[PDB]
Amino acid sequence: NYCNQMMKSRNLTKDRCKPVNTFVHESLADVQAVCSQKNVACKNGQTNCYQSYSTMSITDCRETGSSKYPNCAYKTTQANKHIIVACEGNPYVPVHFDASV
Amino acid sequence: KETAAAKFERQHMDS
């Protein structure tokens, strides 16, 4: 499936099985634009997080309960949700994915 | 090598 394929390709499951990972299907510029949108607090308490005004297309990749390195197995769940990312640097761009509502 | 913004792109971007 898409998750097992993209996780491997992006060097995410080549040397380990990462429990979860979300892929955003919007242009990179549109995602970077979120850093100037709705300012909220990151679950960790920090406040350099921003929620997207609109929902975006995303694919949630979750490891099955059976997955074990080297045979990682993922469950693919497509959806449209508001993304929340932590921004920093100059330019101000996303460095962490916080959640999706 | 890989900056934090670069890593976010490799890990989560799939336009």
Q: Do B14 and A89 touch (CB under 8 A)?
A: no
Gap between the Cα atoms of A69 and A1, Å rounded: 17
Q: Is A4 helix (H, G, I), strand (E, B) or coil?
A: helix
Q: What 8-state DSSP symbol labels residue B12?
A: H
Question: How remote is the C-alpha of B9 from its chain's centroid?
Answer: 2
Chains A, B: CB contacts within 8 A come to 40
Cβ atoms of A53 and A31 within 8 Å: the answer is: no
Q: Is A89 helix (H, G, I), strand (E, B) or coil?
A: coil
Report the greatest alpha carbon distance in chain A. 42
Q: Which two three-digit tokens encode residue B2?
A: 């890989």
Domains of chain A, residue spans: 1-101
Of A25, A27, A89, the CB nearest to B5: A89
Q: Does domain A1-101 have CATH number 3.10.130.10?
A: yes
Gap between the Cα atoms of A10 and A40, Å rounded: 29
The residues with which A76 forms a beta bridge, in sequence order, are: A61
Q: What 8-state DSSP symbol labels residue A54?
A: S
Question: How remote is the C-alpha of A92 from its chain's centroid?
Answer: 18
Gap between the Cα atoms of A95 and A50, Å rounded: 12
Q: Kindly give, in sequence order, each residue whose CB lies less than 8 Å from that of residue A29, ignoring residues fewer than 6 positions away.
A: none
A25 in active site: no
* Residues of chain A neighbouring B1 (CB-CB closer than 8 A): none
Cβ atoms of A94 and A100 within 8 Å: the answer is: no
The residues with which A56 forms a beta bridge, in sequence order, are: A81
Model resolution, angstroms? 2.2
Gap between the Cα atoms of A14 and A6, Å rounded: 11
